[PDB]
Symmetry: C2
């Protein structure tokens, strides 16, 4: 089984990941490609094994948050295109060209300076560029067709850059009111059409995230960017209730009980602040996960974990490295028992959507703040590896 | 200055760690050693460089959450004693003896099993053990004098273990009500004196955290465990208000503006959910930090950052890798401008403590969930490195 000194770990089910890709591949047009988004350590799931697996099973490109995340995938042996979705400093142009990481860019000046850095070094690859068109996200990208033309001309003139994509991001494709999504789409389409009647041939057009690919597959164009759906999580309850694509959650968080005790002697106080007094024959188990792992301190006296198919409440405050749970009066549990923090156990389930609802956040945050000091184990074809 | 592809980073001021150590050193009895707690990646500050500096400037021993965290320190050359505060599986007894990591234990079965594991391996290293006495934290550790005596006996009868410490943890030493802190101390003393009355000589006795080292320095005994105070952060407003010791915060969290734009064209929506709509002449600056870095999504439309010495509000929802801030109508910013997320800038300051109140949590969680994908830079004698 799993041998740890500190007995907490994550299981990422790569069979779920494969299934999530085939579901998306079969929903969207057959012409359209899939870009798997493995930024932020694969939304907390591990970027290397999820990328490796997604490229095996439907994906042809990868997207990350930064050059460094991209280089980690190159060092793992991955030769697929890697697109950086955020901003990359000019000081990393040489390094991105060296690792063949595709950069997002959306400014004329950035293009020219990037091109000179690369020509002043000669012995270079050409740097691939995707243009980010901002159609309503308000984050990064060009916002007018005149500015976009300025950028495409600077890029087309730059001998050491290469134009391989143009994209936009929908900010509300996960919501039932579609008016803003439809507006983003026709803004984008009108921009691409403006470029076409200049006689500018277009590269790969991509615009859909998980929500837009499920809800508007006709927006798939050349490529979609599969993020949250890849991990078997729906972008929102609304997208989930559309019941168009069946996704299967990939991540489970588990631990083993570190210690069990009956609270016979005084004081029967539990954890910092003594916010929880146990009963004389109440049984308190101590678990080796804490808020420094990403298990929110807000789950103090609120959270549940699965122990032997039953939900047992977190007792007292979450500590940096450990939590106490109440097994009840004369509760049954032994040191070493397997506890499920996120995931399924026997009948019962604590999904990350539930923990995210209970914390007034979204599943995206619950999984991508899972600390890297938690080891990740991958299940593929029933069997565990690392 | 600092050259990053993704222009976010942490600065840890080791000169401030030095000062916090001296401040604590003058405040506690000369007999008592200082054990620096660097568990959870040094409370998010980086375990290695903080430990190296602590041992250089007054700390004699280290404490971590797990054997894995101790091995990281040993791999970096640190030879000081290292105590694991948490529970270590029996499957790591041999590894702990090889790396000379000190474990806490509090069970007879664990002692006997740990001993025979090293026995069956003809081990030359005796495994250092500290006994954890639970006097009201209810987390780990032995709870009665009879059980503790049996544990001491099993330890002493174990030729391959070495008893190097006994300790307890204060549940509420950071609160105005000292009732439980006095009670735990009284229990702890009575147990040690119960042991001494049995012809047992005690090893290093330690019990104080930052709070109790500040508020009850007469509890210093042989050694204190300096955690949050090492990083320049007070355990509570109460302990800060007692104005007994002057701590200097060691962490700042900074970034560089990735893009600046005036929201002249429609739509003027900013970020997911279109929860913020800009004015036609409002300046929106995009920053490369997001919830996956540890910047809570709950700061959406509520947090501030420092630009040119001014607090500017987070605009719209925090996204995984980026936030948007409003520089106001006709605001002044350039791409590349340095922004302070946590810490000091010109006159102003966003302290980790303010961010913690804003999120209904404690500074421990704000700092120890700063993600590892953010590079840590170390300032020692007013000069940076990594
Ligand atoms: Cl964007
Ligand atoms: Cl404890």
């Amino acid at each position: 089984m799993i041998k740890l000194c500190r007995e907490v770990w994550i299981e990422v089910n790569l069979d779920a990941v494969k299934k999530n890709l085939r579901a998306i591949r079969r929903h969207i047009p057959h012409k359209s490609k899939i870009m798997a988004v493995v930024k932020a350590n694969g939304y907390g799931h591990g970027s290397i094994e999820v990328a490796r697996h997604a490229l095996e099973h439907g994906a042809s490109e990868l997207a990350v948050a930064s050059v460094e995340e991209g280089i980690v995938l190159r060092k793992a042996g991955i030769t697929a295109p890697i697109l950086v979705l955020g901003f990359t400093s000019l000081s990393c142009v040489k390094k991105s060209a060296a690792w063949n990481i595709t950069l997002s860019a959306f400014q004329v000046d950035w293009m020219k300076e990037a091109n000179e850095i690369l020509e002043k070094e000669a012995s270079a690859n050409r740097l691939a560029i995707h243009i980010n068109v901002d159609t309503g996200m308000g984050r990064l990208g060009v916002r007018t067709k005149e500015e976009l033309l300025e950028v495409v001309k600077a890029l087309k003139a730059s001998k050491f850059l290469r134009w391989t994509g143009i994209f936009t991001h929908f900010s509300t494709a996960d919501e039932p009111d579609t008016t803003l999504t439809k507006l983003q789409h026709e803004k984008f389409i009108s921009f691409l059409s403006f470029l076409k009647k200049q006689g500018i041939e277009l590269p790969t057009v991509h615009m859909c995230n998980t929500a837009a690919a499920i809800a508007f597959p006709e927006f798939s164009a050349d490529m979609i960017r599969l993020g949250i759906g890849l991990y078997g999580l729906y972008p929102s309850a609304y997208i989930k209730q559309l019941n168009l694509v069946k996704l299967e959650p990939a991540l489970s968080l588990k631990a083993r009980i570190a210690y069990v005790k009956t609270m016979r002697t005084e004081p029967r106080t539990v954890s910092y602040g003594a916010t929880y007094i146990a009963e004389p024959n109440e049984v308190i188990a101590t678990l080796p996960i804490g808020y420094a792992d990403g298990y929110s301190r807000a789950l103090s006296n609120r959270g549940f974990v699965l122990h032997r198919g039953k939900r047992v409440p977190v007792a007292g405050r979450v500590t940096m490295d450990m939590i106490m749970v109440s097994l009840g009066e004369n509760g049954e549990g032994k040191q070493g028992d397997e506890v499920v923090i996120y995931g399924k156990q026997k009948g019962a389930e604590i999904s990350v959507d539930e923990v995210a609802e209970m914390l007034n956040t979204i599943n995206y945050e619950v999984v991508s703040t899972l600390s890297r000091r938690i080891p990740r184990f991958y299940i593929r074809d029933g069997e565990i590896f690392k």
